[PDB]
Amino acid sequence: EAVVISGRKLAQQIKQEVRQEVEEWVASGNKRPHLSVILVGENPASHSYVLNKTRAAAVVGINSETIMKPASISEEELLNLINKLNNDDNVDGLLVQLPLPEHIDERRICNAVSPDKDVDGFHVINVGRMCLDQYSMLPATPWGVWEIIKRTGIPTLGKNVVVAGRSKNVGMPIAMLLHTDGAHERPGGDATVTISHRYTPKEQLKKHTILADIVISAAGIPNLITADMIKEGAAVIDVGINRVPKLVGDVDFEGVRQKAGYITPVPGGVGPMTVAMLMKNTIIAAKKVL
Amino acid sequence: EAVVISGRKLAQQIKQEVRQEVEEWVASGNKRPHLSVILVGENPASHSYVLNKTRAAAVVGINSETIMKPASISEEELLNLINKLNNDDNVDGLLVQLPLPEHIDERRICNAVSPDKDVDGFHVINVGRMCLDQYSMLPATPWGVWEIIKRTGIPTLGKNVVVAGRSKNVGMPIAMLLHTDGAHERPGGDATVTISHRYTPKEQLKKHTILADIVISAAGIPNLITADMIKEGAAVIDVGINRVPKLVGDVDFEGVRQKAGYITPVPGGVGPMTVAMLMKNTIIAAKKVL
Ligand SMILES: NC(=O)c1ccc[n+]([C@@H]2O[C@H](COP(=O)([O-])OP(=O)(O)OC[C@H]3O[C@@H](n4cnc5c(N)ncnc54)[C@H](O)[C@@H]3O)[C@@H](O)[C@H]2O)c1
Ligand SMILES: NC(=O)c1ccc[n+]([C@@H]2O[C@H](COP(=O)([O-])OP(=O)(O)OC[C@H]3O[C@@H](n4cnc5c(N)ncnc54)[C@H](O)[C@@H]3O)[C@@H](O)[C@H]2O)c1
Ligand SMILES: Nc1ncnc(O)c1NC(=O)Nc1ccc(C(=O)N[C@@H](CCC(=O)O)C(=O)O)cc1
Ligand SMILES: Nc1ncnc(O)c1NC(=O)Nc1ccc(C(=O)N[C@@H](CCC(=O)O)C(=O)O)cc1
């Protein structure tokens, strides 16, 4: 039977690490770090996630605020707010919760966040730097997936990995991190990585997962991954969070639990790890390391 | 037996398209496009490749100059030359031929070329834009592979693709182009893409290629791709160029020719396509579309 990895427990540990780093940063005479989160509209999942972020900030001693704005705001008004926060020396980290409304260009908005305060790692320079294996502010959810694997000791070098999903914010960075050189400035996982997506037929997906030592599902499709797709002993990391009213992942948890060696639950898996790696990025940003 | 795709004939068609585009541009009263190539040292293959590029430029109506510097040049002197070319309004395209001497930081050099003149697409902002599926100057060798596939009419949406190699200028952009969304600003091939590399066990490479509709070898290893690794009728695209006294690719050409449906030869395959796609990028740069 699979070990169930508690992302909640791993995230709490990481937050303890961040709290200590923050406290020693303040005791050294530095300003306490401050995180600003911009929330647009009323997507209730976005509100839940942002509340979890500001909770975690308080736990680790980082000052925070959520600035909530109606969906009817214009792009230029979002940009004006972002520009004010870019020039406010008290703000160390700035992020815009996604998705934004259709009349707002997410890419222009992400590129307007000063790259030094870009704790989500979505600015194009941070994307390019990550894709070149240079030091960069890593996006929180992919970095949380990497930390789950690394802190559990699941090996990656020479291993077969399948990622289901290719979104720029989640699946693509996860595939980048896992396949790239362990010896480069920002090390990668040196795994053999298959990228699948909405046009992979299920039979081709299965033919690739059945070879995989790690399967990472970030499609947002309930029961996309089932025990027959998984070779036994493999690690299955469930990035999906799907409203079905209850929350499930992409993985058939009880089925795959019988065959995988390791498995993450939804909720309590990747989700809390996302919030933890954002706290790590914020103290990194306050320290002006990059 | 396998169709042998002539990279020479496809490139000739692409180059004729560029010659028509450039002369319509010049007929409209615009400055003739101009490409500057910087060439460092005496790598015989580099000199050979640069001559192919400026020979192609002249035939399609693009003015060119190659600026040759000894390998003993320093990093500051190369940067000085690059800055002079960035500010010369006659120069539309600027590229530095790689590899550079060991004492030169290639990443610093590539980021010094202004992104609007970066016809190789090696600047971090162009790498980031490409990885976000945004309009960008695509690197010429990856774009050549893409064109070989599309112009032969080999389908990609939903097909399995294996790329052997992960280098930032060749293997990684190929994997990015092929797996990404057809509906995005810069369309992608919508394929299921496996990325293999130097830590992929040779047995594991076979188990993925035997599933592959398209194998793309960009590793620089003679005879890495052999007939037992290919399923009957798949397309095999040879990006490697290996000096073995002769030139060969990564594929066992004679053997794989008996099982593949399509195959590219070395020489005369991807190489002339690299030169051709650079001409496309140069007229794009002259038009300042981006
Ligand atoms: N911390 C977390 O766990 C966390 C954070 C953010 C988002 N998510 C969740 O991850 C899932 C998607 O995240 P995202 O940002 O990538 O969203 P997205 O909608 O942009 O991504 C959807 C991805 O699903 C892929 N896909 C669709 N059908 C597929 C299929 N049948 N097989 C393989 N791939 C398929 C699509 O091609 C696309 O790449 C959702 O449940 C989302 O809520 C989780
Ligand atoms: N126009 C062209 O045809 C053209 C242009 C440029 C480069 N190339 C060729 O591309 C090949 C590689 O170019 P590069 O810049 O990527 O060089 P590189 O050595 O930096 O990259 C080669 C890749 O090979 C991978 N690799 C090594 N062993 C492997 C294995 N056993 N199985 C799978 N992958 C393995 C490495 O991890 C690396 O990512 C060379 O032949 C180069 O000359 C061709
Ligand atoms: N959209 C974005 N825009 C900008 N930057 C980002 O990083 C994101 N992405 C997220 O914020 N992703 C995220 C997903 C889940 C949680 C989370 O806390 N999950 C709990 C359950 C909570 C619940 O479901 O109520 C769990 O999984 O246990 C937190 C963040
Ligand atoms: N290094 C770089 N730095 C900066 N930007 C780049 O794009 C590169 N990469 C190349 O320039 N790659 C390249 C490889 C081969 C040819 C070529 O013309 N090949 C012919 C003849 C081979 C022969 O006879 O020697 C063939 O294969 O048919 C052209 C370009």
Author numbering:
A (entry chain A), B (entry chain B): 36 to 279, 287 to 332
Task: Quote the authors verbatim.
MTHFD2, a one-carbon metabolism enzyme, is localized in the mitochondria and plays an important role in nucleic acid biosynthesis, amino acid metabolism, and protein synthesis. It is a NAD-dependent enzyme and functions as both 5,10-methylenetetrahydrofolate (CH2-THF) dehydrogenase and 5,10-methenyltetrahydrofolate (CH+-THF) cyclohydrolase, converting CH2-THF to 10-formyl-THF (CHO-THF). MTHFD2 forms a homodimer and each monomer consists of the N-lobe and C-lobe connected by two long α helices. The MTHFD2 gene is upregulated in various cancers but very low or undetectable in normal proliferating cells, and therefore a potential target for cancer treatment.
